[model samples]
Target: ECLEIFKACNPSNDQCCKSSKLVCSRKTRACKYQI
Candidate 1:
């Protein structure tokens, strides 16, 4: 349920996606797009 785009996230951990393609931005504290 956390593996989604354009969602809120944190650097350490959050409701972010549970995939490798997903990463949390420490600055923004939100899920970003990157490979």
Candidate 2:
């Protein structure tokens, strides 16, 4: 839930993966732009 806060804080800062896929990590609760 808190992670979403950080993400929503700035989608512009958010980057897409090389594969053009974005997923959240269960371990880190952080967004993982798959490369």
Candidate 3:
């Protein structure tokens, strides 16, 4: 399943974000906006 904003995410995993403008951050280990 994908993650929400500020939710934990696996960087190594593909399409780990819920939003189209989201990307999993390695440093924060959470989903951050594309901006």
Which numbered prediction scores highest in TM-score against the true structure?
Answer: 3
Model 2, global lDDT? 0.40
Candidate 1, position 33, lDDT: 62
- Model 3 regions lying over 4 Å from their true place: 11-15
> What lDDT score is found at residue 35 in candidate 1?
49
Overall lDDT per candidate, in order of appearance = 0.56, 0.40, 0.62
Per-prediction TM-score to the true structure, in the order listed: 0.35, 0.26, 0.42
Summing lDDT over every window of 10 consecutive residues in candidate 1, give the lowest-scoring window.
Answer: 21-30
Report the C-alpha lDDT of model 1 over 1-35, residue by residue, as the tens digit. Answer: 36346577744555665555555664255565664
Total clashing pairs for each candidate:
1, 0, 0
Residue 18 of candidate 2: its Cα lDDT?
A: 39
Instruction: Report the C-alpha displacement of residue 32, candidate 3, in angstroms.
Output: 2.2
RMSD of each: 3.3, 8.1, 3.2
Given candidate 3, what's the lDDT at residue 2?
Answer: 64
**What lDDT tens digits, residue by residue, belong to model 2 across residues 5-25?**
224222455433435344554
lDDT of 3 by residue, 1-35 (tens): 56556578765666464546666664377776665
lDDT of 3 at 18: 50
Candidate order (lDDT):
3, 1, 2
